[PDB]
Ligand binder design. Structure first.
Ligand SMILES: [Co+2]
Ligand SMILES: [Co+2]
Ligand SMILES: [Co+2]
Ligand SMILES: [Co+2]
Ligand SMILES: [Co+2]
Ligand SMILES: [Co+2]
Ligand SMILES: [Co+2]
Ligand SMILES: [Co+2]
Lengths: 386, 386, 386, 386
């Protein structure tokens, strides 16, 4: 009956179930949640852990004694429930000081502050046991062309991430960074708008091994991209350090629907890929129960994230294990896709008349790929209609 | 009066002005053009050069004597006009044999053929003087999730590009590759869908220095991305080896409108960036005169590509040179964006109380960015309303 | 096992299974199909009938004796199989003469020709028993703003549809028209781009009762719209005279995937609505088997259209019949949505202090809508995970 | 120098310049503005008037004496400046009670409250001289398919608008309604998502003459539609009762950029159409100065809305008056588009062999439309490059 348990490694941000329902056009529809109560409620649903921005756990501007008490209460909730904290992050987007960015603000003093605020929370993240430190630069970008020279902004972005790498190395921490792309919202265009742009940027950092990506289902879908394809490219690069699961209906504002809502078939192929690849990180949900809901609906929406992942995991495993699917995959030459093109080497390929001079293009063109029969087997498995 | 001359380095594909007007739903509206006549017509408009797919210059399936005569006539047109050939590419998308891809076809024999067809045309490209060899993998991708394992496809894609690098190195050629991303069309999703994905992929090739990107205005806009921002990231990476200029209205089929049509302000900021950065490659137009047009409209549409680039070049230069704009850029702290965040180093930043303990977040938050006044100066310059 | 039979009223266009695979960037991948063979193959799959454009049944430019023989052979196939022809339409988009439109071409002679070509095929449609005559104005529109004055084009569009109404009335035919909106492709923008625009236009025709809409799943999705919502508005207006079923992944070129592919949950809610509303027209598929496929894949893709509709019909019926869903719908106040707001009348509402002066906004705001629990019951029914 | 004066009829909502900068992810960046100060500032810029939601002028929950004082101060500002109030509207979206809608909330008590809150503000609107009463149902819609039966919601929506028509008629008011479509945001899908859907809905009201549309540039662009085309359809229907001007970059969250930003060429063709059609309503700006700005940037952004409209008005008038453009419009057969197709009548068309039997399709197909030369004249006029 698709019941999650902590061994399934499902995690949730405090800001997800704790979202009060404020949007562009609307006031809060739910009261604030104490993080203690969200840890207890999430544990009762079978979650493994929780994640936080600095300012979700400790109100911005807290004194040291207030900070200590917020952390003490949260630690007690973690210890009472067995919940973990595998990931933490910094809020470099809510406060008005970040209206033009944190790490790429035009004001230099704001960039230095953003770094100090991040470093303070990396120390806390390590104390709470986090292995991954996410960075979503939601304010890095522009609404107009003259406001932001992107080459200078990328120079500032590299300096900031290099300084954070130097800091973790200096402290001997075993935490790694996961950069979260998004194409737009709240900025008109956000820097590092997709998984590809973030992977490319990481290759230019001083210590690329310290950084990966934290892709989000709905973010890549806001650019109309195929989320499973982008996760495959991140896995191919060895850079899937964390993932954010939710639902999105295409090219709109970021909806943050529960996982399995939005593009259902993309959710199926995502689960198939994570499970086939043996991804071992948390399955983290960055979602918002809709503001129509009361607290009972918040917990139902959170439970539905995990249930949908487990249903899709069963159907993807049955698809890949079905001998009729295995035969269809060979009929569609998925086995040949996995064989090297020319392990015989360049000169052998140049000398091979079967590759050019004596290649029958028309007989190869006539061979159907059989992809529709394979896809309807996938449909039938997903719908339980075999 | 914005008259282009060959010194402006404007280039056009044979397939652009030569497009006969066939689309998803329509037969040709114009007769085929002899490449000789397109070289002559383009030279008369002030173009610098032309580009080609193999199969635009030599019909697919030509004998050696037919091939020699097509090349001889084209060379004579180039010599009669002074036109150059700075770029060439392979057609790995029209023939039905490429229905599942060239370099990432599931059929191995098709992948080997795609490589041999590419290598034959690299030799011709070098004979005609091309410095850049573009690769647009328009058939690499899928319409369904089971049809294409993307990690295996990227392994095949890397093998293919590595073999092409080994080939050019083996021959001592001074040609470089430019990979052209596109998010979709004709495949439901195309592999390497954006500039970021292509830049990331190149970093994993055996000899990354041989490869850059060939971004196209309309391709990045089909994902709703900011094309000038993506060009800035490619320039930041040192990888803008070629560029395709055209117009697109957002998230649709690839419209291939003349340059300056589609998103006009994005065309302005693109020209501003290419000119500020001192980009020295061809300004290449990959566009289609609409099928409503006769040949006079084809040449008017081609002339309009160049005219719009030259108008936008004048207005962007006037914007950057205007002392009132220079003052607005300082008021918006574009100068501070270009200064290192912490050249004093990590420990100095950690010890700097002005970056945290004594940073007045509210006074920094209250300082307006003045971006709207700067953007209306940019508007006024673009519209000639100063 | 979800086996369709003719009683299910599934229909297919000749151009669907008969699509040879030519696209923007590619030559045909399959040979042409004789309409006789498509009628036989579709009947064997359990289809009810077929539909046609004039030029799919009779090649454009046929002599009268050729026309008679094409019609005779097609009639024999219909009689051999028991297949019906419930709908026909005109091709006013392929021939180059329609490059600027049929009914709204700027050239008046082309508009008059488009009307004569339509009227000739209305007579044939009636002879073959069609009840619905579709009109998809795929060439009505523009790529540039000066090319098409839209108020004048709508005047021409109304004249054309009014003349077609006068013609059918004059002949005593019992056929009705169904106008098919599309937002773009092949024109940069198409006139009557959505269901709403077409419904609005029909209200201004001389005899609106003769006209309804023929919405297509993928067309409304090319504008990012909710297809079930648009079908609900057409049903509310009494104007769903025909429907085109297929799949689409959001905002791209028109993919024409088999029904159930693309947005699966939207396919579920569409079937739920058509079945709840008692829609009695054909379930018509306007799709294209992908060009990767051979003929066996064409028939598998066609069979999959019908199978997916039948699976979704079973799951939507089980959802609506489940007493736990019925209780959830009452908890979410779907029953109250169906009750008049103020059957007591305006003055009673004005005098009702419970509607204003004594309405407790905070107690009403606090009541959760319970929509997430209702939606996860819908998910569980769709996936067979109850 | 493009200086607006009140005779230009530019109007602004209090909520536009008064937007404090709160978004999905961010706190306010500017202090609240007193409506008195916004009226004074807008008048100094040359605006004609202002518009309001009920709750922008009178805080929600005000006592009668507070209400009277807010209205008294606002009236004094209007009288001090000569500013008008041509339009008002109701806020049926911010308060949590409207989380599922106002007029189509599933809770009947909320629907009755939404009507009473609207009617109270219609009385105030009439006292302040408004001729148009806008209704943007931003909360009407859903995030999930079971939550909202759209046929029942449209029944509730018609009841509500019919009751409002009965109310204005009963009071003898000369105010008319303008329904504002939007496709999504804040709801996952909003009911009446485009101009077409709203026009269609109005035709089913009891007294359609009382209702028109209030289209917004950015709303239609959030569906990827052509805003000038949609305004042309509203003008063709006689239903453009008000218009909201702003900028948007395609398919994203609603950006509300100043008018002229976003799609510049669409802004040009919009101004060309409003001015050619002799639209006589207010040119209203529904925009948000970006939250990066301080108050000086708010007023610069507001001034830029008006400046851009006046620049585009000059360039569109010069385009239409240029004898070379007039010749190009005849070469493109825009004159023939405006002539009836068959004023000779149906039987004459049927008997006309020049329309079918003797129509030379190939000679008509060969005639180019000359649209690219016409569009580059439009480009040159817009850019001041003639
Ligand atoms: Co998100
Ligand atoms: Co996230
Ligand atoms: Co293109
Ligand atoms: Co290109
Ligand atoms: Co379609
Ligand atoms: Co269709
Ligand atoms: Co808006
Ligand atoms: Co508005």
């Amino acid at each position: 009956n698709y019941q999650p348990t902590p061994e399934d490694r499902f995690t949730f941000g405090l800001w997800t179930v704790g979202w009060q329902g404020r949007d562009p056009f609307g006031d809060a529809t739910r009261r604030a949640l104490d993080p203690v109560e969200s840890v207890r409620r999430l544990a009762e649903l079978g979650a493994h852990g929780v994640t936080f921005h600095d300012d979700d756990l400790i109100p911005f501007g807290s004194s040291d004694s207030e900070r200590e008490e917020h952390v003490k209460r949260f630690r007690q909730a973690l210890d009472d429930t067995g919940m973990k904290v595998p990931m933490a992050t910094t809020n470099l987007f809510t406060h008005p000081v970040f209206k033009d960015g944190g790490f790429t603000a035009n004001d230099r003093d704001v960039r230095r502050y953003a770094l100090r605020k991040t470093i303070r929370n990396i120390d806390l993240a390590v104390e709470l046991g986090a292995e991954t430190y996410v960075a979503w630069g939601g304010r890095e970008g522009a609404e107009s062309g003259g406001a932001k020279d992107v080459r200078d902004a990328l120079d500032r972005m590299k300096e900031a991430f290099d300084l954070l790498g130097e800091y973790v190395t200096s402290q001997g921490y075993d935490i790694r960074f996961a950069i979260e792309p998004k194409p737009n919202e709240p900025r008109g265009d956000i820097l590092l708008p997709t998984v590809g742009h973030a992977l490319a940027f990481i290759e230019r950092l001083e210590r690329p091994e310290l950084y990966g990506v934290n892709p989000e289902v709905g973010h890549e879908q806001m650019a109309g991209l195929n989320f499973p394809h982008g996760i495959a490219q991140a896995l191919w690069a060895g850079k899937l350090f964390h993932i954010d699961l939710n639902g999105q209906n295409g090219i709109k504002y970021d909806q943050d629907l529960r996982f399995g809502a939005g593009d259902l078939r993309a959710a199926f192929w995502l689960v198939d890929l994570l499970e086939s690849a043996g991804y071992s990180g948390p399955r983290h949900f960055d979602f918002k129960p809709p503001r129509t809901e009361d607290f009972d609906g918040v917990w139902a929406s959170a439970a539905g994230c995990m249930r949908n992942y487990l249903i899709l995991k069963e159907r993807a495993a049955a698809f890949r294990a079905d001998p009729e699917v295995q035969e269809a995959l060979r009929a569609s030459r998925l086995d040949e896709l996995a064989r090297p093109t020319a392990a015989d080497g360049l000169q052998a390929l140049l000398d091979d008349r079967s590759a050019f001079e004596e290649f029958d293009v028309d007989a190869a063109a006539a061979r159907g790929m059989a992809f529709e029969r394979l896809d309807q087997l996938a449909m039938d498995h997903l719908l339980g209609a075999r």
